[PDB]
Enzyme design. Structure first.
Site, PDB file in Angstrom:
ATOM      1  N   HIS A 175     -41.514 -13.838 -33.698  1.00  0.00           N
ATOM      2  CA  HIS A 175     -42.326 -13.912 -32.477  1.00  0.00           C
ATOM      3  C   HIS A 175     -42.447 -12.537 -31.807  1.00  0.00           C
ATOM      4  CE1 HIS A 175     -38.175 -15.141 -31.648  1.00  0.00           C
ATOM      5  NE2 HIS A 175     -38.290 -14.559 -30.467  1.00  0.00           N
TER       6      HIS A 175
ATOM      7  N   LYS B  71     -52.989 -26.596 -36.509  1.00  0.00           N
ATOM      8  CA  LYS B  71     -52.568 -27.828 -35.841  1.00  0.00           C
ATOM      9  C   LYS B  71     -53.478 -29.003 -36.206  1.00  0.00           C
ATOM     10  CE  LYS B  71     -51.950 -30.052 -31.312  1.00  0.00           C
ATOM     11  NZ  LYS B  71     -51.515 -29.885 -29.897  1.00  0.00           N
TER      12      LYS B  71
ATOM     13  N   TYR C  22     -54.688 -13.889 -29.823  1.00  0.00           N
ATOM     14  CA  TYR C  22     -55.348 -14.067 -31.113  1.00  0.00           C
ATOM     15  C   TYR C  22     -56.507 -15.045 -31.064  1.00  0.00           C
ATOM     16  CZ  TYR C  22     -52.206 -11.228 -33.867  1.00  0.00           C
ATOM     17  OH  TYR C  22     -51.526 -10.184 -34.431  1.00  0.00           O
TER      18      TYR C  22
ATOM     19  N   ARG D 274     -49.206 -17.646 -38.621  1.00  0.00           N
ATOM     20  CA  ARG D 274     -47.743 -17.767 -38.771  1.00  0.00           C
ATOM     21  C   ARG D 274     -47.266 -17.423 -40.206  1.00  0.00           C
ATOM     22  NH1 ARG D 274     -45.587 -18.083 -33.476  1.00  0.00           N
ATOM     23  NH2 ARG D 274     -46.216 -20.047 -32.460  1.00  0.00           N
TER      24      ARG D 274
ATOM     25  N   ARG E 210     -45.036 -10.660 -34.019  1.00  0.00           N
ATOM     26  CA  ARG E 210     -46.403 -11.158 -33.892  1.00  0.00           C
ATOM     27  C   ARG E 210     -47.010 -10.632 -32.610  1.00  0.00           C
ATOM     28  NH1 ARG E 210     -49.604 -15.957 -33.742  1.00  0.00           N
ATOM     29  NH2 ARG E 210     -48.099 -16.781 -32.233  1.00  0.00           N
TER      30      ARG E 210
ATOM     31  N   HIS F   6     -54.463  -6.800 -19.587  1.00  0.00           N
ATOM     32  CA  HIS F   6     -53.478  -6.643 -18.529  1.00  0.00           C
ATOM     33  C   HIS F   6     -52.940  -7.984 -18.051  1.00  0.00           C
ATOM     34  CE1 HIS F   6     -57.240  -7.600 -16.628  1.00  0.00           C
ATOM     35  NE2 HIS F   6     -56.536  -8.049 -15.602  1.00  0.00           N
TER      36      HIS F   6
END
Length: 239
Positions: free
Chosen positions: A134, A62, A169, A38, A137, A160
């Protein structure tokens, strides 16, 4: 969506690397692209969070939990280059632990870095006002998953599935960490490079002019057209 691969590539290429400031932004963008970090985590990285030797960055995510995220080869190169040749000029003697300091030796904020990103997005022919973190990213994620040379297996199983940015990620980090744990205006310049070095490789043209992989590739393609190079499976040397 609405960002094309081509817009992504121009964006990454837009920074002017003889300017310490933009060389910083170049490293920043390459880290963002490869890691999916981020913006708030990016602008907050310290010198101690990087290991160029190991090819990873330590990010407190987190739960304030430390994890290792592989950087990839381009981010490592541009970090090295930035640390050697750009960052000292941002300090002017000042000593601080902030990886990406501002013009005046301070930690940037998400919003001031975002102002930089808007500048490059304009050059790249992107609507800098509509653009959001967003969407950016996720276009990085999608492009990485589709072009990362080591990620073809992940592309095949998940490309897909229309996964979220974070999920892409996470799968990318897992696969890359697994591997670590196992042990055109440049055309005339390019022609003189390849006819001199004699080896014609997408990788060499890439690192020789510090451009993206797909641009290097479309330069070895404009050459096969004009009669200059041997085919993957010819011109005389200068001087």
């Amino acid at each position: 969506k609405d960002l094309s691969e081509a817009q992504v590539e121009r964006l990454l290429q837009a920074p002017l690397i003889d300017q310490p400031l933009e060389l910083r932004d170049k490293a920043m963008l390459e880290v963002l692209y490869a890691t999916g970090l981020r913006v708030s985590e990016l602008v907050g990285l310290t010198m101690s969070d990087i290991s160029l030797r190991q090819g990873v960055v330590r990010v407190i995510g987190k739960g304030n939990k430390e994890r290792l995220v592989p950087l990839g080869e381009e981010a490592v190169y541009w970090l090295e280059t930035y640390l050697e040749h750009g960052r000292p000029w941002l300090l002017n003697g000042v000593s601080i632990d902030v990886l990406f300091p501002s013009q005046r030796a301070q930690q940037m904020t998400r919003q001031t870095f975002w102002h930089r990103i808007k500048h490059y997005a304009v050059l790249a022919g992107i609507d800098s006002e509509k653009l959001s973190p967003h969407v950016l990213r996720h276009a990085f994620a999608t492009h990485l998953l589709n072009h990362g040379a080591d990620l073809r297996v992940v592309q095949m199983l998940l490309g897909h599935s229309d996964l979220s940015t974070t999920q892409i990620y996470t799968h990318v980090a897992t696969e890359r960490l697994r591997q670590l744990h196992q042990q055109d205006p440049l055309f005339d310049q390019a022609v003189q490079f390849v006819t001199e070095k004699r080896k014609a490789s997408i990788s060499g043209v890439q690192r020789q002019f510090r451009i993206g992989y797909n641009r290097a590739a479309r330069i070895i393609e404009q050459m096969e057209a004009q009669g200059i190079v041997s085919e993957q499976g010819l011109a005389p040397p200068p001087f």
